């Protein structure tokens, strides 16, 4: 499979999550995703084919993971936006007020702005601290997916939000949305990963 | 807020 940010993958033939970003760790290919998507050694599949396994994760507290892929996988510096792509150029952290888009297998590509940083989410499992909030909408299934500026700067991976009974927060005004992502920079230094850029 |  061609690894693109925002595409669906399954965990142990049950849950679905979305790919965050292609990364490497020395000669190992991988992708960053959300921690709550799977446990260590869970098998990830893309299109019914095994692509790799969860190598590490932290959830709750933080919400981060990376899946080490087999060498058959093709890592690409891109995030899906409909049939088009956004190229990943680096990971400069944008500030509050900055515009940001996110990509995932349920709501697709959605944009909004960063409204707050260092938010705590109190999920059933425990609190996850230090999340950034934006008001781009998102749905169940979008977890793990890319948050990126149109300029190509990778921001982080989808954690969660104030999802309504229809499964997303797209049907409530932007003013009332709270979609939270885990910052990419701490995930990259914690696991010694380097972002694939183009 | 919930995971996703």
Describe the model.
The complex is a heterodimer of chains A (198) and B (4). Chain A is mainly beta and 198 residues long. Chain A has one helix and 17 strands. Chain A has an eight-stranded antiparallel β-sheet with strand order 3-2-6-7-8-5-4-17, covered by helices on one side. In chain A, strands 11-12-13-16-15-14 form a six-stranded antiparallel beta barrel. The longest helix of chain A is centred in the C-terminal third of the chain and has 8 residues, at 184-191. Chain A has one helix at residues 184-191, and strands at residues 2-5, 8-11, 15-18, 21-25, 28-33, 43-46, 49-58, 64-69, 74-81, 84-87, 99-104, 108-123, 126-134, 146-148, 154-161, 179-183, 194-195. Chain A has two domains: 3-76 and 184-196, Thrombin, subunit H; 77-183, Beta Barrel (Thrombin, subunit H). The interface between A and B is medium-sized, with 22 and 4 residues. It is classed as hydrolase/hydrolase inhibitor. Keywords: active-site mutation, serine proteinase, hydrolase-hydrolase inhibitor complex. It forms a dimeric assembly. The entry is titled "alpha-lytic protease with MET 190 replaced by ALA complex with methoxysuccinyl-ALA-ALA-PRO-alanine boronic acid".
List the helices and strands and how they pair.
The complex is a heterodimer of chains A (198) and B (4).
Chain A: E1 2-5, E2 8-11, E3 15-18, E4 21-25, E5 28-33, E6 43-46, E7 49-58, E8 64-69, E9 74-81, E10 84-87, E11 99-104, E12 108-123, E13 126-134, E14 146-148, E15 154-161, E16 179-183, H1 184-191, E17 194-195
Parallel strand pairs in A: 1-9
Antiparallel strand pairs in A: 2-3, 2-6, 4-5, 4-17, 5-8, 6-7, 7-8, 9-10, 11-12, 11-14, 12-13, 13-16, 14-15, 15-16
Active site (chain A): 36 (charge relay system), 63 (charge relay system), 143 (charge relay system)
Organism (chain A): Lysobacter enzymogenes
Disulfide bonds (chain A): 17-37, 101-111, 137-170
């Amino acid at each position: 499979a061609n690894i693109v940010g925002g595409i669906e993958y399954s965990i142990n033939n049950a849950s679905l999550c979305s790919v965050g970003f292609s990364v490497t760790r020395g000669a190992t290919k991988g992708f960053v995703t959300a921690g709550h998507c799977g446990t260590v050694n869970a098998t990830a599949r893309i299109g019914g084919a095994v692509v790799g396994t969860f190598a590490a994760r932290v959830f709750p507290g933080n919400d981060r993971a990376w899946v080490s892929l087999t060498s058959a996988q093709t890592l690409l510096p891109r995030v899906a936006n409909g049939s088009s792509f956004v190229t990943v150029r680096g990971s400069t952290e944008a500030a509050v007020g900055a515009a940001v888009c996110r990509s995932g297998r349920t709501t697709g590509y959605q944009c909004g702005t960063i409204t707050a940083k260092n938010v705590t989410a109190n999920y059933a499992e425990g609190a996850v601290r230090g999340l950034t909030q934006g008001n781009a909408c998102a749905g169940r299934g979008d977890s793990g997916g890319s948050w990126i500026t149109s300029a190509g700067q990778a921001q982080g991976v989808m954690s969660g939000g104030n999802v309504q009974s229809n499964g997303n927060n797209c049907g409530i005004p932007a003013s009332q949305r709270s979609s939270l992502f885990e910052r990419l920079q701490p995930i990259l230094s914690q696991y010694g990963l380097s972002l694939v850029t183009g | 807020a919930a995971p996703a």
